[PDB]
Structures are given as structure tokens and as C-alpha cells.
């Protein structure tokens, strides 16, 4: 989320390495849209049901299940993509990248 | 979340402090505040546990995925606890204010 963007900024790189990294982004960008989508949909499902009847209901129950699973999915996809970017780093840059990742996770960033 | 902070103000400002629906309102709030603090503590711990896994071994693993799932679950518990509370508070609000209350709620939900 902002986790994703934070880790991109911990990634030191010249003019060449950046253009290459951006080209490599598209695999994850799409995966992602696919997930920010289901989640944004599950939320609208939630809000729709509440504007209808602001009380718990089978629709609200189902929507919240959907919101949850989707947000987990999104963090998992983010992490997968973050470890792939880690693999493309020179060994000398790995410790700083790990530090940023661990500390962001620890304080609840995604 | 779910516009909670702002919904409570709508409460401070619809049922007067010379009303005593006030007392009941604040007791419900005390209970929710306590449940939230507990769930939040549990989310903080799931976050630490995910961070710990990654520090131990910075790569995707069943251990890291596991932690991820504990985090989603604590987070979902928090949203659910908050929503059911928000509904409870609405049911205790005089019909003359549900309109404005419902606005704030749906707004926030649609974000
Ligand atoms: Cl350069
Ligand atoms: Cl409230
Ligand atoms: Cl208060
Ligand atoms: Cl609290
Ligand atoms: Cl990996
Ligand atoms: Zn990326
Ligand atoms: Zn109050
Ligand atoms: Zn409240």
C-alpha cells in the first residue's frame, strides 16, 4: 500500500536499473488491480447493504467476509512482489531494505 | 474506522447531556472502547509476529503466509466489532437523527 511505495523508495538505482524495474512492475500492477478491485467491490457491497438497512444481515455478514479475505490477499500479493524485488537487489543493499520492510510491518504499514 | 470518531460526535450533539440517554450512550461506549483496545493489542501482536518471521527469514514461506492470515483475521475482527457497535448506537438514537448519522456512516464506508 504505502508499504509498497516505501519499499520502492528504499531501492537505490541508476537511470538504467529504474527503467528496467518499471518494465518489470506490470506483472504486479495488474495482480494488484485485480485485488484492489474485489476489495473495493466488497466494500461497496457493504455500504449498499447498510444504506439499505443499517443493521447486521446475511448481506453484511457476507460482504465483511469478502472485505477481509481480499485485504489479506492484497497484503500477501504485496509481500510476494516485495521479496521478488529483494532478489533483484545487490547483496549490499539487502540489509537496509530488510530493515525498512521489517520496521514498516511492525508498526502496521501495508 | 467506519467513521466512528465522527459518529460519536453526532451523538454528543443529538442527545443532549441533559438527556440521560447520555449515560446509557457512554456505558455502551466504555464497553466498545475496551473491546477495541483488546482487539488492537492483538493486531499489534500479529504485526510484530509477521515482522519477526521476516526478520528471521526474509522470504515468502508458509510461516510468513501464516502470520499474514493472523493479521487479516485480527483486522477483520476489529472492523466487525466496530460496525456492530455503530449499529447498536444507531438503534438507540431517536429517529430524528438517524438521517444525519446514516450519512456519515455510509460516506465513510464508501472510502
Ligand atoms: Cl544514472
Ligand atoms: Cl459511537
Ligand atoms: Cl466520550
Ligand atoms: Cl479503544
Ligand atoms: Cl521470496
Ligand atoms: Zn512494485
Ligand atoms: Zn462521548
Ligand atoms: Zn462508539
Swiss-Prot record, chain B:
Keywords in alphabetical order: Cobalt, Coiled coil, Nickel, Periplasm, Plasmid, Signal
Residues of the full protein shown: 35 to 145 of 148
Intervals, Periplasmic compartment: 1-111
Main localization category: periplasm
Assigned protein family: To A.xylosoxydans NccX.
Coiled coil: 20-83
Official protein name in the record: Nickel and cobalt resistance protein CnrR
One GO cellular component term noted in the UniProt record for this chain: periplasmic space
Record's note on what induces expression: By nickel and cobalt.
UniProt subcellular location: Periplasm
Originating species: Cupriavidus metallidurans (strain ATCC 43123 / DSM 2839 / NBRC 102507 / CH34) (Ralstonia metallidurans)
Amino acid at each position: 500500500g504505502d508499504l509498497h511505495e516505501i519499499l520502492h523508495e528504499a531501492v537505490p538505482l541508476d537511470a538504467n536499473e529504474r527503467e528496467i524495474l518499471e518494465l518489470k512492475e506490470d506483472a504486479f500492477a495488474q495482480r494488484r488491480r485485480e485485488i484492489e478491485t474485489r476489495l473495493r467491490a466488497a466494500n461497496g457491497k457493504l455500504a449498499d447493504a447498510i444504506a439499505k438497512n443499517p443493521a447486521w444481515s446475511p448481506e453484511v455478514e457476507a460482504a465483511t467476509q469478502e472485505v477481509e479475505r481480499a485485504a489479506g490477499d492484497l497484503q500477501r500479493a504485496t509481500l510476494v512482489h516485495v521479496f521478488e524485488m529483494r532478489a533483484g537487489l545487490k547483496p549490499e543493499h539487502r540489509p537496509a531494505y530488510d530493515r525498512v520492510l521489517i520496521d514498516a510491518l511492525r508498526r502496521g504499514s501495508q
